[PDB]
Amino acid sequence: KKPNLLIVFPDEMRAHTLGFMNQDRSYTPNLNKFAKESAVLKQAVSNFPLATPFRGMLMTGQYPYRNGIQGNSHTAMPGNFGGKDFGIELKKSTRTWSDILKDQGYSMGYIGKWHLDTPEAPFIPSYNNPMEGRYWNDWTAPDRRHGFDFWYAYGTYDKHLTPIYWTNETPRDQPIKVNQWSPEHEADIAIKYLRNENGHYRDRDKPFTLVVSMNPPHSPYDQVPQKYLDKFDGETSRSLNTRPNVQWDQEYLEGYGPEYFKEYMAMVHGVDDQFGRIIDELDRLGLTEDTLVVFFSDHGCCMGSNGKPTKNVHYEEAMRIPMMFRWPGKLTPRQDDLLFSAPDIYPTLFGLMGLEELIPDTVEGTNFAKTVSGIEGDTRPTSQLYTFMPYGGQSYGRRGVRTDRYTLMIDRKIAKPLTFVLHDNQNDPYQMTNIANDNQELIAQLIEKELIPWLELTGDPWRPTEVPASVAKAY
Amino acid sequence: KKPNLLIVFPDEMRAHTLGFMNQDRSYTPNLNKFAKESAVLKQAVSNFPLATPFRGMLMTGQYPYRNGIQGNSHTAMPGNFGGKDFGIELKKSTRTWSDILKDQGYSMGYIGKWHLDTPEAPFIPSYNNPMEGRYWNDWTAPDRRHGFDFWYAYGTYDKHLTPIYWTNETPRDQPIKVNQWSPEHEADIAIKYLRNENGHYRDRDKPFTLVVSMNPPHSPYDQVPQKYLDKFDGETSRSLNTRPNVQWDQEYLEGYGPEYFKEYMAMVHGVDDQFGRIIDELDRLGLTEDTLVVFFSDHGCCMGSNGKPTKNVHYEEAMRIPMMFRWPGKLTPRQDDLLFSAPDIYPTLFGLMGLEELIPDTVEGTNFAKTVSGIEGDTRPTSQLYTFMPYGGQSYGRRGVRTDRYTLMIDRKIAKPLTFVLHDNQNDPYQMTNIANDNQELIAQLIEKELIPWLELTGDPWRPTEVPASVAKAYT
Ligand SMILES: [Ca+2]
Ligand SMILES: [Ca+2]
């Protein structure tokens, strides 16, 4: 009766990698089939396209300004700065949707990358503890798992072929060290959770929520199984990465950029294979009709498009994420260009499951269960907020809006003119031209109709005005 | 049957000015009598002791970080910075307690100083439009009055003897220009609201909320009726301002500081008189038992105590505010030392009125209606948050905690060691000594047990750590 919830989301998988989207030269047969059984939001975005900010929005239904999860949740070495110096973490006292489902009588499981805690001293052994001025990895202590009674997760760790996990059984100092591609290992654990063979993964009498947060197709690109690379045998990153806005002649940081596109596509194929294993097991078990399945990613990846290596930019390749909802017998398959945003996920899931009344007032996103279900009545957004927040600078950085036609981005520094970037996504679908100059009137309307209303709705203090050097005098 | 709500609050009146407190040498007979009939919260504070931040907390029950009302709501001149550059204003889409009460079927009236909107161009004529690089005054348009269907109010305007107001009947370009001390004029309007002769002010069949927001004893100090000054004939500012921590030889901005203490006491006395007039009319009309009456202020005023002229500091004279609830037949008179905070006002009032189920999840303050009613069982706070937020610097500035014994304040700047100020308020009642250096372990305990939990509760990203100069390179 009470519905189950299965959430699968890989990391850094742009919507363009979905084969049925007719964009990237990719091979995702399992997700293609899933899409034709699902209600697909084809215009969904990650408003702050960065892992930790997105997970903040997923767990809280709030935008970054009020949830405080405004960057990476890392911890500085002495003389440096990191997320911990600005409260960037999911707080123990925060009531997430996973807390609420737990109190509704659910068994709750989380598999994979958590990426929401700041590491604490003494820091655990880890190749990234420290790395580039910061400590990055730690377990999640049991009192910080927000209702997930089954745990099989880590903080941040990118060695895809040798992942490490903490579980109900592990103490902090002895995690499970795995020799297996992490998506496959995570699919294996998901299968066992779904089967619940010994009865100790979850309660037989309760509904369940399982989250599987895969790391690939996130970098690095040298930890991909040969099996999945073999799917693109004979092709190269050049022959595969054909998007017109790719800048091959830009200089990229070692290990990143369009020359790794073949590896990216192979990881996408690999994740598609493992997603298929999980869904096939769900259906083999007879759980298809009682389980709402949702697939998305935390942000996209530019892979050289417009000269950007990965994410954390306003471009379509970083903002656009998959978003699909499958529930055969209760959701009719469809596609919709709803301007969906990351804080809408939480309340929309609650709406779909019949739990609208449990959405607290603190949620800033919108319940679009009606639109997903093909039912009239939602107010359709005219824009999606874009944001980049520099550490400690909530009143500065980049803000922008994405409408059904334009992407506008504004950068704000102290004592400098505002920089404007404007794309006509209709005439310029690959966002290769900035038309901000001599579009003052259109930009003014976008600011007045879209950006300011989002900023006021979220409490964000950023405003599109210059400020003199004296404003920083005080601090 | 549904209770009325009368809120009266003057500006910049520290708790120490109440005669029954046995602190300042003040004459407040009407407030002394009101106190003997009320539930009095003797330790209430304004956590961000500045006008517009307090009003933000009053209307939203949220702390400043999440409500965004983090400074003065003024508008900069070209080349300057103001509140408007950082969203510092009540947003039209924000649902306040006044919006909620309106939907419950109340008549809602606001008299006096609003001080919650940024001025818009073209800027109305006003002595402070501009003043010191910013525009300060404007009306409040009908769609921004948040359920207050009777309006008699202004934005920011300190000419206490010639105030200006907008009402339902006034366009932006012709306000009402008054020649009368603002608290007296506002008491006049409030009495007319309560009488409601011929039904012009409110619906006789609805409960009402009336807010009277007075400006005195806020500066300036040369706009006081001579009548009120005459009460202190034979005294001087020197003879009245005897607090041991007053620093007479500090350098003060022209028109501020301890030499204006007589004027300050005279305004307090004047406001007490006018408060008495409003309460007497309410009781004469037989509304006493159906009306919850609340008196507070938005912040205190140091008046030279510890060398500070006015507010926006952690000292007791700036943080401590009056706070009294009268409702004869429902609230037994009492005195309580609860560590009450400004975001608690809204939910506590809803609690007292039987409206606790209407408090939204966004409210961060706590409903202490039981404590105010003398009923045991509330979780008593162990501290009150202090905050100073520089314009555009939500991660920096001063933060602190006030407990039943200590006040700790920490100031955080980019590429600087933290500065620590600690007062033992028990042994150093006037906070004249900073004992921070000899109490490193106590400070660690206060940060861990009090400050960090408040910061996490409020979402405030400020943390007590040094950050290097490089942190600002991304946005300078
Ligand atoms: Ca990510
Ligand atoms: Ca004030």
Author numbering:
A (entry chain A): 46 to 520
B (entry chain B): 46 to 521
What does the paper say about this structure?
In this study, the crystal structure of endoVB4SF was obtained and refined at 1.95 Å resolution. EndoVB4SF adopts a globular conformation with two monomers per asymmetric unit. The refined structure revealed that each endoVB4SF monomer folded into α/β topology containing 12 β-strands (β1–β12) and 10 α-helices (α1–α10) organized into two domains. In the larger N-terminal domain (residues 20–420), the major 8-stranded β-sheets (β4, β3, β5, β1, β6, β7, β2, and β8) are sandwiched by α-helices α1, α4, α5, and α6 on one side and α-helices α2, α3, and α7 on the other side, forming the catalytic domain of the enzyme as observed in other sulfatases. In the smaller C-terminal domain (residues 421–521), four antiparallel β-strands (β9–β12) are flanked by two α-helices (α9 and α10) located on the solvent-exposed surface. The N- and C-terminal domains are closely integrated together through hydrophobic interactions to form an extensive positively charged groove, which may be important for the binding of the substrates. According to the endoVB4SF structure, the two molecules in the asymmetric unit form a dimer, primarily through interactions between the C-terminal domains. Size-exclusion chromatography analysis showed that the dimer-forming capacity of the endoVB4SF-C27A mutant was notably reduced compared to the wild-type enzyme, suggesting that the Cys27 residue is involved in forming endoVB4SF dimers through the formation of intermolecular disulfide bridges between the monomers. The active site of endoVB4SF is located in a pocket at the carboxyl end of the central parallel portion of the β sheets. The predominance of basic residues in the active site, such as Arg100, Lys158, His160, His263, His344, and Lys356, generates a positively charged surface to facilitate the binding of negatively charged CS/DS substrates.
